[PDB]
C-alpha cells in the first residue's frame, strides 16, 4: 500500500509543505532520507534529523527510527467542519 504525506521543515523559507510518497514497508530512516532529498538537505547527515507526525496544534508523535512508519503513525482520518450562523 502507499499514501501521500506532507513534509514541512522549520526553515521560515516560504514553503508550507512538500509532499512525498510513503509505503507500507518504509521504515523511518528511508522516509527521513526521502524527506531531506525533497527539501534539499541530502548533503547533510540523516542522523541529525527526526520524523515527527503532527496530530493537532498541541499533539505530536515522534516516529522512532526503528519503526515501520505506516504502523507507528496515527492513521486516523478526520474531517473538520464549522457549524456557522449565516
Amino acid at each position: 500500500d502507499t499514501c501521500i504525506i506532507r513534509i514541512s521543515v522549520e526553515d521560515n523559507n516560504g514553503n508550507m509543505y512538500k509532499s512525498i510518497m510513503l509505503t507500507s514497508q518504509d521504515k523511518t530512516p528511508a522516509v527521513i532520507q526521502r524527506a531531506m532529498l525533497k527539501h534539499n538537505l541530502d548533503s547533510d547527515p540523516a542522523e541529525e534529523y527526526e520524523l515527527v507526525q503532527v496530530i493537532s496544534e498541541d499533539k505530536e508523535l515522534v516516529i522512532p527510527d526503528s519503526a515501520n512508519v505506516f504502523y507507528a503513525m496515527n492513521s486516523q482520518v478526520n474531517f473538520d467542519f464549522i457549524l456557522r450562523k449565516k
Binding site: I4, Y17, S19
Partner: protein, 169 residues
C-alpha cells in the same frame, strides 16, 4: 490582510515548480524533482496593497490526476502553464481550463495563460497561437522564463489582479 489562493497547473515538466520557487524564494536550479503537491506562502506588495499569496504547486503527472477534482474546488485563481518547446503541454491547456470550470460550476474563473521557458531557442508553440487562444478565453497571456526570471512577477501578479476584479464582481 487579503489573501489570494493561487493554484499552478499544467503538464509534466513545464516549469510550474520553477516559476513558483522563483516567485517565493528568488532562486532557480536546473534539477529533477517531480511534484506531488507543494504549498507556499508569502506576503507581498501588489499595486501598493500589502497582501498574502498562498500558492499551491500541483502535479503534472497523470498518476496523481484524481487529486484535481479536490484542489480545484478551493483555488481562487489558476496559472495555466505550458512550455513553448512542448506542443503537447500547450494542447493540454484546454483540458485544464474545462476541468476547472466543471469543478467550480463557473464559466468565469480567474485564470492566466503562461508560456514558460521563453529563454529557449527550440520553440515549437507560436506566440501568436498562444495569444489567440488566450483571447478566445478572455484571459491574459504572459511569456515567462523561470531561468532568467523574465515575467515571473507579471504572471502571478496579473493573476492576483484578475482575482481582485472577480471578487469586486
Amino acid at each position: 490582510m487579503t489573501e489570494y489562493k493561487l493554484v499552478v497547473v499544467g503538464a509534466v515538466g513545464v516549469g510550474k515548480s520553477a516559476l513558483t520557487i522563483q516567485l517565493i524564494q528568488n532562486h532557480f536550479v536546473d534539477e529533477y524533482d517531480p511534484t506531488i503537491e507543494d504549498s507556499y506562502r508569502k506576503q507581498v506588495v501588489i499595486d501598493g496593497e500589502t497582501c498574502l499569496l498562498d500558492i499551491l504547486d500541483t502535479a503534472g503527472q497523470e498518476e496523481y490526476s484524481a487529486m484535481r477534482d479536490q484542489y480545484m474546488r478551493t483555488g481562487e485563481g489558476f496559472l495555466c502553464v505550458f512550455a513553448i518547446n512542448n506542443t503537447k503541454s500547450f494542447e493540454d491547456i484546454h483540458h485544464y481550463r474545462e476541468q476547472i470550470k466543471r469543478v467550480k460550476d463557473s464559466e468565469d474563473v480567474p485564470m492566466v495563460l503562461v508560456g514558460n521557458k521563453s529563454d529557449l531557442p527550440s520553440r515549437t508553440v507560436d506566440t501568436k497561437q498562444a495569444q489567440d487562444l488566450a483571447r478566445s478565453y478572455g484571459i491574459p497571456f504572459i511569456e515567462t522564463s523561470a531561468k532568467t526570471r523574465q515575467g515571473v512577477d507579471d504572471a502571478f501578479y496579473t493573476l492576483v489582479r484578475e482575482i481582485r476584479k472577480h471578487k469586486e464582481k
